[PDB]
Structures are given as structure tokens and as C-alpha cells.
Design a protein that fits this description.
The PDB classes it as signaling protein. Keywords: Membrane protein, GPCR, signaling protein. It forms a dimeric assembly. The complex is a heterodimer. Chain A is an alpha/beta fold. In chain A, about 30% of the residues lie in helices and about 20% in strands. Chain A folds into 3 domains: about 5-145 and about 295-330 and about 330-380, Rossmann fold (3-Layer(aba) Sandwich); about 150-290 and about 400-420, Rossmann fold (3-Layer(aba) Sandwich), CATH 3.40.50; about 450-500. In chain A, strand 13 and strand 14 form a beta hairpin. Chain B is α/β, with parallel strands linked by helices. Chain B has 3 domains: about 5-25 and about 35-165 and about 305-410, Rossmann fold (3-Layer(aba) Sandwich); about 170-305 and about 420-455, Rossmann fold (3-Layer(aba) Sandwich); about 470-523, Tumor Necrosis Factor Receptor, subunit A, domain 2 (Ribbon), CATH 2.10.50. In chain B, the strands form 6 sheets. An 8-stranded mixed sheet of chain B has the order 11-10-12-13-14-17-18-19, sandwiched between helices. The chains are: A alpha/beta, B alpha/beta. Chains A and B meet through helix 2, strand 4, helix 3 and strand 9 of A and helix 2, strand 6, helix 3, helix 5 and strand 11 of B. The structure holds advantame.
């Protein structure tokens, strides 16, 4: 079966195949894609004579239902091959079933596992968990990442908004940890950079095919009403893809149109939401995601409890075309994580590129080695920061709906080492003549016309003419009119005084 | 002294216990490179007192016969060391097989025998989460003092977690009820930037939105002041309060942050406001030491009303005197507990006998577990159905619908694992030569409040309104972190109200005029 492969050393793999016992939930295609990514990476390493000569690399993969079924896979990985796990003062000489764990896909599962593996210092690499809390290596000594953190995603969003001068935005978050965290983080970033959040709302947690009750429906009605009333036409959504199925259908019910939707990675490249053709009429969709790296030949490969999935293959076959036209974005993180483990093991065995000596691997030594790897995988170097992150590029993608070509066009690229957004290309807007849409609380004042604030938001101000005899030195203060010298006078609407009685 | 030797006792059923008996020496708080054991020699009296409370409860249960007639209840206590690694080490030994040094991996775990019946939970919320996710896979009941985070209410992820302290949501419900009672509709929310304020702010904002109270702004404040940037952000927050024209501030922040805020406010005065306190702040003298605090304006909050345990003091002193006896060694589970001669304790907290609430909560947790077992064995006044050895997942069914007698109080866990317990409402009296807390109401699910004892500073009730409807003659502008409020602008002469739902006062045509607050543009 697909979930197991023997070898000399076994990699543990944790993926969330099913959404929402864990078989009975609906299957998510992205998780199966990532699992196949790991399988392909191990296949390459076993075929290649260079990296681990004569040493078989195996894997053992277990399903994780989001926050469910997190303890049992860890206990299974840590057992001493006879299902017993001894308790000891010191573990330096202990030998677990797996030498490394390719950790879960979400922050809460990652932290749940890390609080366990931190005891054993069994290395955990997570490919898609973005929370910035994971940088605490006193709290999470065994944890590394092949993906940038939420810091860089929010920085990319901020620089995107600054480039197009979107001062006035709406933030929508889910009713759970991820939305709360990212909303507060964006609140931190926005305030110091001259942008203002008009209002924030917590969306209800709705199952996509559940019959929505009256209370939930009127909650959604209220949210869309607030959207319709506000002058802020730019919307940021921090939510799992599952809950947006009802929200966007309500937005369609209210005949709302004309916004720019900024998608966080959790849904920026979801093929399922992308297949809702009716979203085309809402406005422009932009999203933050990891860079595209074309894995050569992975598409051709893509063609004891909780280690099974019946629906996975049948569910994936229909999306195969869309996944093939896409850029293999998050797949690369899993592939690079497997290769990082492989290189670290290659160094730990002290292996020459002829043959390796075979010896017992205590995981803490493999963790020792993983911190030091530095190699070119396809073009990009992958090495770990002192805080455990790998500096992969991020990209801003626009959704396209011509099914014959790439569904997620890249329109900007972000560099985390430079902390800069770069190489912005032609976005095709929803506007009547493709002019850049904007969102500002108030229009730019004229010359000779001071500002006067309306409220808490620095972005909102009245424009008031300086009375005759006073002038507006904008270089000193735009909110105050200065008095002219006794030998000069000023008109109703001019910047500086002139000689007059 | 013979003290650490007292923390384990034999019995037919054994209660596990996690306590802050100490902590690792401070320099040890650095990254692990190799999975060695961790030292924890920094003894603490707080954990000692709590463990003594648990031992007292179990000894009382063994003495009497109102519970578990004719059979013996024991205990086995481990230190958390306030350290996740050591906590996990200790937590695993609870679930290890009977009389064995190992734990086994199985698919469906309702098949298994651990070496303890239930675990009296850890002190801090972080460890409460860490262990609750672990124990509830084994469905071992965990009864926690001192853990109040609302995250642990969820039955889906913490199905076996119980606690003998109210969740923070109850206190925030009391707060919102107070705000409703005084019609303070327009308020500012502040919380410490630690996790406690994070959770509190989220819960308070959601409740306020649900009940129709509009948060002007939602600011995190520094848990401690160390940099000019943190001073900058807190001063920015405080000026943002003034910009909002809010008069009532809900400050759900740990004591250090509030002390910082009020230090600045005393230095440069700000202006008097109504402050609704986190219970953790209201308990402390630290804030009240600040000079001439009456400048601040009224401080209010809700306080938990625990029962007395007077016998506990003499119990602790008796057992310490016994521990000092070298012959009592004939009567290993803690580092350096045995070094603590009585001066270290009698010069300090022993003279204090909020620690009281945790002592009572530990006592009540032990009694709750004992009552649950008493139910599961279906004991008569003199008989029990002991033919089969009980398993932890069997207690879990009985605990959701029992009631247990915590020596005077009758308590029961609600459907999501919390005790129903009431509060006092207290207000700082400043008319006396020194600040004094005085009781002016109670919350037992409804706010039974005594108006005549509210000494407001202006001798009149404060107000903070916002408009949620606007008249015919006034145009709307939205405000609030959730667009909850409006305020209405008088549309001036020469302009008119276009229609009653619009957001723009409209100038009248050049050949025409209009009165003040006009609905029409006239020849
Ligand atoms: C609490 O977080 C969340 O609820 C969301 C949604 C989620 C829940 C459970 C399992 C996966 C995702 N988390 C994220 O999106 C995390 C960020 C973080 O969690 O730090 N980035 C994953 C990006 C690639 C991805 C992989 C697996 C997918 O489905 C199995 C999927 O849809 C997307």
C-alpha cells in the first residue's frame, strides 16, 4: 500500500488527508498531493546512486485529521519497534522506529507534536506551518521549516497595498486560532505603515455542505451588509478554504461586486474554491503563496490505524489537469524537507560518495547535522536560519479562469532575505478601463487647504481652507495654518503669503 | 527534614498529582542539545502548600466513611518544574503500565490499564493545554485548579478535562453584565500582550459584539516595560483612548502591565476614567502603592468568593514539625524539599494563612474525584461493588452529572467541565486615609447589585454612549472596531439630507437655500 515502505532508516510522515475515527471525513486533494510529493522524493533518493549509496531510505506515513489524531502517530513513531516505549531519565542511547518526522501541515498540530518530540529531540520538519511562535527554539528545539513564516506573508501584503496606495482596508478572520493570530499580526504591521483598517469581523465556522441555520445566515447577512456600506473596497481574508463556500455565496446573494480580495496562503491556491465560476463577477482575487519550482517528472508520478484512504485516487483524478497546469508550489517544500533529511543523514554516516557504513542513528545527532546542511537542490540553496527557517521566495498570484492555461498567474515576487516585494507585472483588474482600483478614506486636499482629523483613523481627515491672512507651510504641518508676516497677506486658497498692507 | 518522602502513599486507587514544587535554576533556560535530564532544585513554597492541601483531603477521605467505605485511597505527586519537558516526563509515568517502567502504543486506547486513577492538574494554563491534549487521548480524567483559559472548555479537543475554578468567560460575562446595567455602551478594551490578555480580549470582544456593546479600540499593552519602543506603543495606546472620547476602560491585563500603565498615567496625569479590572490585577497591592492614585478614577472588578479552610494552617504546621523530627524518617520525590527548615516558610507565606482559593480548589478537586469513584462503585453506606477494578474512562461518565460536597459548598461540573461558582463585585474606597476594597454586589449568573453603595467620583454616574440610530436631521458616520456605532452630524444650512440612510450631507443647488438640519433644498 501507499502509506508504508521498508528500508534501513525510516522517515515518519504526517499529512492531513481528510478535512474537518478519521476515515469518514471528506478527502482534501492538497494533502494527497503533498503525500505524493514525499513519496516521489524518497523514490528519487533510492534511485540515485550519489546521495545514499547502498542505504535504503524508507518511509511510514500516518493521516492527521487536523487537530484530531495527533498523539497516536507520535507514540507509534517513538516506539522501540515492539510497540513498547521505555521511560528514562536520559535518552541519548535510545533508538526509535523513525529517525526523522516530516511534520504536520498546520501550526496547532505542529506544536502539539513538538511538545512531545522536544523530549526526545527527534528532528521535526514542517513544510507549511507559518506561525511565528515556532521560531522559539527554547520552546521548540527540534523544529525546522522549509517555508517562510507569517511575518513575511504580512510584509508582502503590506508592500502590495503600499504599491497601489490602498490606505483603507477590511480584514475578515475565521473564528479560530489561525484567523485570530494573523488578524492581530496584520493589525501590528498595518498601523506603523500608514494603512488603516476600516473594520474587522470574525466569520462563523460553517461546514461547506451543512444546512445553514437562520442565526448563522443572519450573521453572514450582517457581515456582507457592513461590507456593502463601507467605502473600503479592499478585503483581506484569513480563513480556511472550507468556510468561504457559504460566505462567497452570500456575497453573491447580496449582489456585492467591485472589491479586491487578498487571499492568505490557506486558500490562495485552493483548486476547489477556484472552481466556483461565479466568483469571477465579485472582483479581483490576489493571493500570497510560496514560489513555483517545477519538479522534473513529478506530474508523471502523481498519475496500523489511520494508514489508509479509499477515495484519494478517485478524488484526485478530476483535478489532475488543474494541478498539472499549476506550479508545484507547496510540493517543493515537502521534497526539499526529504532531501534535507537525506543530506543530513548522508553527513551523519560520515559517508563517502562510494559507500556508506551502516550504524545506529540516535535522532539527536541527526538533528545536530540538519542544522548544518547547505546544498543546491534544483536551483535554490536550502539552508536553515538560526531560527530554523529556509529562505524560499514568496509570490503574489492572480486567479485566472481560462482553463486552457495556468490558473494562478504570478504577478509579483517577494524576497525574504531582502524583505522586499519585486518585479510587479500587469494585473488585469475588474475596473471598466483597467485603471488601478483604490481605497482611501478621504481625497487628497488641495493647495492652501489644511487637514483636520475626523476620528481615530489617521487616514481620515477633512479638508479646510486656510482663512485669508494665514498660509499653509505643508513642510511644517499640514493640519495647521500659519499667520502671515505683518508686511504680507494671503488669499483664500494659496500656499504662501505675498507683500501687502 | 523528612518531607519529600511523604509525597507517595499506598492505596487501592491512586490519585496522580502535578504541582509547582519547584523550578529549574534560572541559567538552565537555554536550548537543549542532547536529551539529558533537567535539574529543578529551586524549591517553591506554593507547590508545597498545594500538595499539603491534597494530602489533607485524601487523609480526611480515609478517616471518614461518607465516601468509599472500607477501602483505601492513595496518591502519587510529581513536580511540574514549570517545564514542559519535565511535565511530559512525569505525565508519561502516570500512564505507564501497572508496576512497569514503560508505555505501549495501541490504536483504540479504551483497552488499557494505567497506574493511576486520575490526575490533579497542573497549575499554569500552558501546561494545562500540553497535558490535556495528552491525557484525553487516554481519556484519563484531569481535574485542574488554577487553569482558567477558555480554550480548555471545548469538549471536542479536551473531552476529559475538568477544573474547580471558573473559566475567564464567567468573569467577562459579569463584566459585560455590569456594563449593560450602567448603560456604558461605548468602551475601550485593553489586555496584556501575554497569552492571558490575548484570550481575554478575544472573549470580551466577542461577547460585547453579541450583547450590543461597541469596542472603540482593542489594544494590547506591554507585559513589562524595558524599552523606549514599548513606552512608545503604550503611550500611543493611552492617547488613542483619549482620542476615542471613551470614559470606561476594560483592562483585562496582568498586574505588571497595569502597574506600568498607571505609572505613566500618574506621571503625566491623563484624565480620570472608569477601569474594570481583571481579577488578577484587582487582587494586588502593587498598583495601589502608586502615589495619589485617586487621580486615576474608580477601579472596579469581580472577585471569587471561596470558602474557609482554617484547619489547614495547623495541619501544615504539624506536618512541618513532624518533618523536622529526625526519628520521623522511619515514617525521594522532590529536589531539595528536604533542605527547607521552618524559617524559610514561617518568615513568609505561612503568615498569610488568593493562595487560599487555590488551596480550596485543590481540596475540592480531590473530593470531586473521590465522589466520582464513590458513585462508580455504587457504594452503599457499608458496601461497594468492588468485584471489578475501575478504569479511568469509566469515571469519566459519572463525573459529568455528579455533585460533590467541598466541605461546605455543593459543586457540580457543567456539561463542559466547569464548576458553577459565584462572584463578589468590589470597588476601591478612596475616601478613607488608605485605599480599601468594599463589596457592592454579587454575580451568581445574575448581577444582584447594590446601587446605594456606589461612591462615584463626581457624585454622579459616569456615562459613555454612542448612537446606534440617527435622527432625520442628522447624517451618519460609522465608528468602532467592528463598525458597531454611529455618531450623527447636523447637516448644515445650505445643505440637506438626501435620504435617511445616506452617508453624505448634500449641498443645495446654487440658486436655492435650505434651513439648518433641512430635509429639502428650496427656491
Ligand atoms: C489552524 O490553521 C488552519 O486552520 C489552516 C488550514 C489547515 C487546517 C488543517 C490542515 C491543513 C490546513 N492552516 C494552514 O493553512 C497552514 C498554516 C498554519 O496552520 O500555520 N498552511 C497550510 C498550506 C498548505 C495546505 C496543506 C494542507 C491542506 O489541507 C490538508 C491545505 O488546505 C493547505
Amino acid at each position: 500500500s501507499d502509506f508504508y515502505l521498508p528500508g534501513d532508516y525510516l522517515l515518519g510522515g504526517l499529512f492531513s488527508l481528510h478535512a474537518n475515527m478519521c476515515k469518514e471525513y471528506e478527502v482534501k486533494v492538497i494533502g494527497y498531493n503533498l503525500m505524493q510529493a514525499m513519496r516521489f522524493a524518497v523514490e528519487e533518493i533510492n534511485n540515485d546512486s550519489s546521495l545514499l549509496p547502498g542505504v535504503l531510505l524508507g518511509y511510514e506515513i500516518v493521516d492527521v485529521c487536523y487537530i484530531s489524531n495527533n498523539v497516536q502517530p507520535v507514540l507509534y513513531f517513538l516506539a522501540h519497534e515492539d510497540n513498547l516505549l521505555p521511560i528514562q531519565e536520559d535518552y541519548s542511547n535510545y533508538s526509535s522506529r523513525v529517525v526523522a518526522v516530516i511534520g504536520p501541515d498546520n501550526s496547532e498540530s505542529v506544536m502539539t507534536v513538538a511538545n512531545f518530540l522536544s523530549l526526545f529531540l527527534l528532528p521535526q520538519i514542517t513544510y507549511s506551518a507559518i506561525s511565528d511562535e515556532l521560531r522559539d527554539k527554547v520552546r521548540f528545539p527540534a523544529l525546522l521549516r522549509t517555508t517562510p513564516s507569517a511575518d513575511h506573508h504580512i510584509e508582502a501584503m503590506v508592500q502590495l497595498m503600499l504599491h497601489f496606495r490602498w490606505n483603507w482596508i477590511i480584514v475578515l478572520v475565521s473564528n479560530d486560532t489561525y484567523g485570530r493570530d494573523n488578524g492581530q499580526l496584520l493589525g501590528e504591521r498595518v498601523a506603523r505603515r500608514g494603512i488603516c483598517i476600516a473594520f474587522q469581523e470574525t466569520l462563523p465556522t460553517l461546514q461547506p455542505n451543512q444546512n445553514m441555520t437562520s442565526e448563522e445566515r443572519q450573521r453572514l447577512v450582517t457581515i456582507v451588509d457592513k461590507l456593502q456600506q463601507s467605502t473600503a473596497r479592499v478585503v483581506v481574508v484569513f480563513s480556511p478554504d472550507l468556510t468561504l463556500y457559504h460566505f462567497f455565496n452570500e456575497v453573491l446573494r447580496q449582489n456585492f461586486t467591485g472589491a479586491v480580495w487578498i487571499a492568505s496562503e490557506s486558500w490562495a491556491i485552493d483548486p476547489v474554491l477556484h472552481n466556483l465560476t461565479e466568483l469571477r463577477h465579485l472582483g479581483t482575487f490576489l493571493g500570497i503563496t510560496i514560489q513555483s519550482v517545477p519538479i522534473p517528472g513529478f506530474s508523471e508520478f502523481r498519475e496500523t490505524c489511520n494508514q489508509e484512504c479509499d477515495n484519494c485516487l478517485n478524488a484526485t483524478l478530476s483535478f489532475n489537469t488543474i494541478l498539472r497546469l499549476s506550479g508545484e508550489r507547496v510540493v517543493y517544500s515537502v521534497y526539499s524537507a526529504v532531501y534535507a533529511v537525506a543530506h543530513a543523514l548522508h553527513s551523519l554516516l560520515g559517508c563517502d560518495k562510494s559507500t556508506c557504513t551502516k550504524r545506529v542513528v540516535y535522532p539527536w545527532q541527526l538533528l545536530e547535522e540538519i542544522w548544518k546542511v547547505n546544498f543546491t537542490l534544483l536551483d535554490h540553496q536550502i539552508f536553515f536560519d538560526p531560527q530554523g527557517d529556509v529562505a524560499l521566495h514568496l509570490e503574489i498570484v492572480q486567479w485566472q479562469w481560462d482553463r486552457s492555461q495556468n490558473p494562478f498567474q504570478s504577478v509579483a515576487s517577494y524576497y525574504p532575505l531582502q524583505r522586499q516585494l519585486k518585479n510587479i507585472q500587469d494585473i488585469s483588474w475588474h475596473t471598466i478601463n483597467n485603471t488601478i482600483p483604490m481605497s482611501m478614506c478621504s481625497k487628497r486636499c488641495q493647495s492652501g487647504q489644511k487637514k483636520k482629523p475626523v476620528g481615530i483613523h489617521v487616514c481620515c481627515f477633512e479638508c479646510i481652507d486656510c482663512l485669508p491672512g494665514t498660509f499653509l507651510n505643508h513642510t511644517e504641518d499640514e493640519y495647521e495654518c500659519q499667520a502671515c508676516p505683518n508686511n504680507e497677506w494671503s488669499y483664500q486658497s494659496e500656499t504662501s503669503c505675498f507683500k501687502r498692507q | 527534614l523528612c518531607l519529600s518522602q511523604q509525597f507517595k502513599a499506598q492505596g487501592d486507587y491512586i490519585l496522580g498529582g502535578l504541582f509547582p514544587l519547584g523550578s529549574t535554576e534560572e541559567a538552565t533556560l537555554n536550548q537543549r542539545t542532547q536529551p539529558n535530564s533537567i535539574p529543578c532544585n529551586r524549591f517553591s513554597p506554593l507547590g508545597l502548600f498545594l500538595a499539603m492541601a491534597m494530602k489533607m483531603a485524601v487523609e480526611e477521605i480515609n478517616n471518614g466513611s461518607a465516601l468509599l467505605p472500607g477501602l483505601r485511597l492513595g496518591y502519587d505527586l510529581f513536580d511540574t518544574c514549570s517545564e514542559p519537558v519535565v511535565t511530559m516526563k512525569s505525565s508519561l509515568m502516570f500512564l505507564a503500565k501497572v508496576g512497569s517502567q514503560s508505555i505501549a502504543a495501541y490504536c483504540n486506547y479504551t483497552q488499557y490499564q494505567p497506574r493511576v486513577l486520575a490526575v490533579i492538574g497542573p497549575h499554569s494554563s500552558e501546561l494545562a493545554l500540553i497535558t490535556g491534549k495528552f491525557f484525553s487521548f487516554f481519556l484519563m480524567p484531569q481535574v485542574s485548579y488554577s487553569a482558567s483559559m477558555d480554550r480548555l472548555s471545548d469538549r471536542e479537543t479536551f473531552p476529559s478535562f475538568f477544573r474547580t475554578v471558573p473559566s475567564d468567560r464567567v468573569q467577562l460575562q459579569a463584566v459585560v453584565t455590569l456594563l449593560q446595567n450602567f448603560s456604558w455602551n461605548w468602551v475601550a478594551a485593553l489586555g496584556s500582550d501575554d497569552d492571558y490578555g490575548r484570550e481575554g480580549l478575544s472573549i470580551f470582544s466577542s461577547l460585547a459584539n453579541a450583547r450590543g456593546i461597541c469596542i472603540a479600540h482593542e489594544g494590547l499593552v506591554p507585559q513589562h516595560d524595558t524599552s523606549g519602543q514599548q513606552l512608545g506603543k503604550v503611550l500611543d495606546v493611552l492617547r488613542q483612548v483619549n482620542q476615542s472620547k471613551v470614559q470606561v476602560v476594560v483592562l483585562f491585563a496582568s498586574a505588571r502591565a497595569v502597574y506600568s500603565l498607571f505609572s505613566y498615567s500618574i506621571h503625566h496625569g491623563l484624565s480620570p476614567k472608569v477601569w474594570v479590572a481583571s481579577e488578577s490585577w484587582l487582587t494586588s497591592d502593587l498598583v495601589m502603592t502608586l502615589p495619589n492614585i485617586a487621580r486615576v478614577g474608580t477601579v472596579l472588578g469581580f472577585l471569587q468568593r471561596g470558602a474557609l479552610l482554617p484547619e489547614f494552617s495547623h495541619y501544615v504546621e504539624t506536618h512541618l514539625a513532624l518533618a523536622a523530627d529526625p526519628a520521623f524518617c522511619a515514617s525521594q520525590r522532590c529536589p531539595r524539599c528536604d533542605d527547607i527548615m521552618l524559617q524559610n516558610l514561617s518568615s513568609g507565606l505561612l503568615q498569610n494563612l488568593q493562595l487560599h482559593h487555590q488551596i480550596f480548589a485543590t481540596y475540592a478537586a480531590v473530593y470531586s474525584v473521590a465522589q466520582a469513584l464513590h458513585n462508580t462503585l455504587q457504594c452503599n453506606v457499608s458496601h461497594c461493588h468492588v468485584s471489578e477494578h475501575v478504569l479511568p474512562w469509566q469515571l469519566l461518565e459519572n463525573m459529568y452529572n455528579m455533585s460533590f460536597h467541598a466541605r461546605d459548598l455543593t459543586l457540580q461540573f457543567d456539561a463542559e467541565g466547569n464548576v458553577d461558582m459565584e462572584y463578589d463585585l468590589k470597588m476601591w474606597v478612596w475616601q478613607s486615609p488608605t485605599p480599601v476594597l468594599h463589596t457592592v454586589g454579587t454575580f451568581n449568573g445574575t448581577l444582584q447589585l447594590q446601587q446605594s453603595k456606589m461612591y462615584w467620583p463626581g457624585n454622579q454616574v459616569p456615562v459613555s454612549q454612542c448612537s446606534r440610530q440617527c435622527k432625520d436631521g442628522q447624517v451618519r458616520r460609522v465608528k468602532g472596531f467592528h463598525s458597531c456605532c454611529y455618531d450623527c452630524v447636523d447637516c448644515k444650512a445650505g445643505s440637506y439630507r438626501k435620504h435617511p440612510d445616506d452617508f453624505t450631507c448634500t449641498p443645495c443647488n446654487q440658486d436655492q437655500w435650505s434651513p439648518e438640519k433641512s430635509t429639502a433644498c428650496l427656491p
